[PDB]
């Protein structure tokens, strides 16, 4: 197939794979009003 695509078809070999969705990111609040560390601790990675 590489020979066919390059020699006579004269093109780069097409390569495909399942496209994954964009990463999901939580949207933290700029000012955590009345937000403690224990509650934020669970939400944040550190815990």
């Amino acid at each position: 197939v590489t020979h066919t695509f390059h020699q006579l078809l004269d093109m780069r070999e097409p390569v495909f794979e399942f496209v994954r969705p964009p990463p999901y990111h939580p949207k933290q609040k700029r000012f955590p009003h009345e937000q403690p560390l224990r509650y934020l601790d669970r939400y944040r990675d550190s815990h």
């Binding site: 695509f5 078809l9 004269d10 093109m11 097409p14 495909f16 496209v19």
Partner: peptide
């Protein structure tokens, strides 16, 4: 080159493509 033009994602319509791939 006209041949180089290729879509970003492939279009496989074989019913057993997924089954054969697993």
């Amino acid at each position: 080159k006209e041949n180089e033009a290729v879509a970003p994602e492939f279009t496989n319509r074989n019913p057993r493509n997924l089954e054969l791939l697993g």
